[PDB]
Amino acid sequence: YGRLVSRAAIAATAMASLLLLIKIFAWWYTGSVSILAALVDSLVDIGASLTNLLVVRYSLQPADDNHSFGHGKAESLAALAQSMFISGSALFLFLTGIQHLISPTPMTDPGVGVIVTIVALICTIILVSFQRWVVRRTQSQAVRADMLHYQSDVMMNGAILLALGLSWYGWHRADALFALGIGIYILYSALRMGYEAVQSLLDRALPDEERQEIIDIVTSWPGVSGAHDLRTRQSGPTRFIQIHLEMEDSLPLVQAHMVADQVEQAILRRFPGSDVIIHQDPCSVV
Amino acid sequence: YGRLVSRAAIAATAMASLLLLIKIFAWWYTGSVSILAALVDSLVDIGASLTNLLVVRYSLQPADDNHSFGHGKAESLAALAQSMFISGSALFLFLTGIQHLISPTPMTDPGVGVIVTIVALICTIILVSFQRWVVRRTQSQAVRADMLHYQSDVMMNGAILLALGLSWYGWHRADALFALGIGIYILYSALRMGYEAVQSLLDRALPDEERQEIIDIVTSWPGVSGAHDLRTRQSGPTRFIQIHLEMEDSLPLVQAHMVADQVEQAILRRFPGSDVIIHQDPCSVV
Ligand SMILES: [Zn+2]
Ligand SMILES: [Zn+2]
Numbered sequence A, B: 001y002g003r004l005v006s007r008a009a010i011a012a013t014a015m016a017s018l019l020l021l022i023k024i025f026a027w028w029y030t031g032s033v034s035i036l037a038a039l040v041d042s043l044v045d046i047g048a049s050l051t052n053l054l055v056v057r058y059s060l061q062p063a064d065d066n067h068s069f070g071h072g073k074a075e076s077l078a079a080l081a082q083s084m085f086i087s088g089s090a091l092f093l094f095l096t097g098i099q100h101l102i103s104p105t106p107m108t109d110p111g112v113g114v115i116v117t118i119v120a121l122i123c124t125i126i127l128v129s130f131q132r133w134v135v136r137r138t139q140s141q142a143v144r145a146d147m148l149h150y151q152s153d154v155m156m157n158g159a160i161l162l163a164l165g166l167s168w169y170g171w172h173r174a175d176a177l178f179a180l181g182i183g184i185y186i187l188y189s190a191l192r193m194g195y196e197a198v199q200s201l202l203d204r205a206l207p208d209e210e211r212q213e214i215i216d217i218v219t220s221w222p223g224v225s226g227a228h229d230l231r232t233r234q235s236g237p238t239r240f241i242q243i244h245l246e247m248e249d250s251l252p253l254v255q256a257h258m259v260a261d262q263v264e265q266a267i268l269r270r271f272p273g274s275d276v277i278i279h280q281d282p283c284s285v286v
Helices: A010-016 A043-056 A074-080 A131-137 A144-153 A179-186 A210-218 A254-266 B010-016 B043-056 B074-080 B131-137 B144-153 B179-186 B210-218 B254-266
Strands: none
Touching: A010 A043, A010 A131, A010 A144, A043 A074, A043 A144, A131 A144, A144 A179, A210 A254, A254 B254, B010 B043, B010 B131, B010 B144, B043 B074, B043 B144, B131 B144, B144 B179, B210 B254
C-alpha cells in the first residue's frame, strides 16, 4: 500500500532527512577561512527538518488513541504554518522595494559581492527534486510539499543568473527576482499549503470523484435501493446508512450485515479510509 | 438548546460586537485636541473583530455542504492563531528587557507620561466580563475565549497602578508588569488556545466522561451485549457498531434498527453530536 503508493515510508523520509542531510551542513565560512556569508537560513532551515520530521512521525500512529483518537491531520496543520505564515510571507522580505532609490540602480547593489561560492549549493535542488518524487508517489498529504519553500529557498535566480553587461544595468533583481516571490509565494503556500491547512477543517469530504466512485459502488450491490449518506474527509474517512428502500426496508435480517461490510469492504478502492462505516437503514426516508 | 446553553447566539455575539462596539471607538487624540497617544491596538483590535465575527459566522452553517461537508472547526482553527501566534507571543514585546539599564530605574521610564487619560478605558473590562459570560454559557468552542487577549490587552497594571513614592523607585514595571505576560500568555494562548487549536486534530474524541456516559447508555438497552466502538470529536461527533454479542449476533431483523436509533436517539444527552451513527453489528469479534 505505502512502501511506495501510500505515506508509509515515502512520506517518512524526505523532509525527515531531506533535511537531516542536505542542510545538515554545507558551509564552513566566517570562522576558518573568513570570507563573508550572512545567510544562515541553515540553522533556520534546521527547524524545518526536525519540525516536519517529528511532526510526521505523529502524522503517524493509531493515536494517543484514547485522546488523540486517531491522527495525523497533524501534517495538514504543520503545513498551515509553513504556508500562509513563515513562507508565502517569507515572500515579504521582498514584495518589491529596492527598485527605485540609489540601491539596485547604477550604484549600491549591482557591484558588491564578487566573492560568490554560493554556487556551492544550488546543487541542493537535488533534494527538492526528491521531495518532488515524494509528491505523488504519495503526498505526505502534501505536507512535505512545503518543499516548495525550498523550490524557492532555492530561487537564486539573481544569484548565478546576473544580467551582467548585456542590457539591464542594475535592474537584475528589479525583475527575475521580484515576481519570484509574488506568484510563487502568495500563490504558493499562501494558498496551497494555506489550504489542505484550512481543511484541518474536515470537509472537502471529497473531490467529487471518489465521491462519485464511492457512490456507484454502493449504489450497485445486492444492498440496493437504499443509499442514504456518504459524508467524507482526509487519510481515509467515509461512512454510512443504506439498505432496503424497496422493501428490505425492515424485511431482512442481520445476516445482511456483511452486505454492508461487503460494500464497506468493497470500498477497498482506496488504500483506504476507515471501515468507513455503515449504518444499514431498512425504513425509508421516502 | 443554544438560545443560552449552546453556541447558537451566545457564541454569535461577543467578539462579534464586543468588538463591533467596544473598540469600534473610544479615542479622539492626535488630530483634534493634540495630546499624545501612540497606542492604536484599536484598528489592530479591529482585525480581531471582523476576523472572529465573520469566522464564527462560518463556524456556523450546515457547510459548503458538499465540499466543506459540515464545519466550524473553523473556530478552533481561528484560535490557534490568536493563541500561540499573535498573542501568547504578543507577550514577547515583553518577556523582560527594560529592567536593568538606565531605562526603568531612577531616570528614563518612571517620569515621562503624566498626561494619562488612558484611564478613559479600563472600563472596557465590561466587555471581557461579557466575553466572560459567553464562556460557559457556551464556549464559542472557547474561540471567543481569545477574549483573554483582552483579559491582558486590558492589563494596564502598570498604568493606573503605579508604585509612585512608597518603596519601588522605577521598579514599577520590572514586576507587576513583567510576569504579567509570562504566566498569562505563555501559559495562556501558547497553551490554551494553542490547543483546542491543536485538536483541529479531531481527537480528544472525548473527555473520558461523556465518553463514560456515552458508553453506559448504550451498554444498557435492549441492544445489549454488543458494544463495539465509540470513537468521538468537536461540536457533536460520535458513532458506532453494536448489537448482539450473545446471540442476536445475526439472529434479529431490521426492525432492530430503531433500536440503535433508539440508542442513538437516546444519546440525546448532549445538545448533540451528529446521529452519531450506528453500524449495528450482529456477529461477534469474540
Ligand atoms: Zn436510521
Ligand atoms: Zn462489521
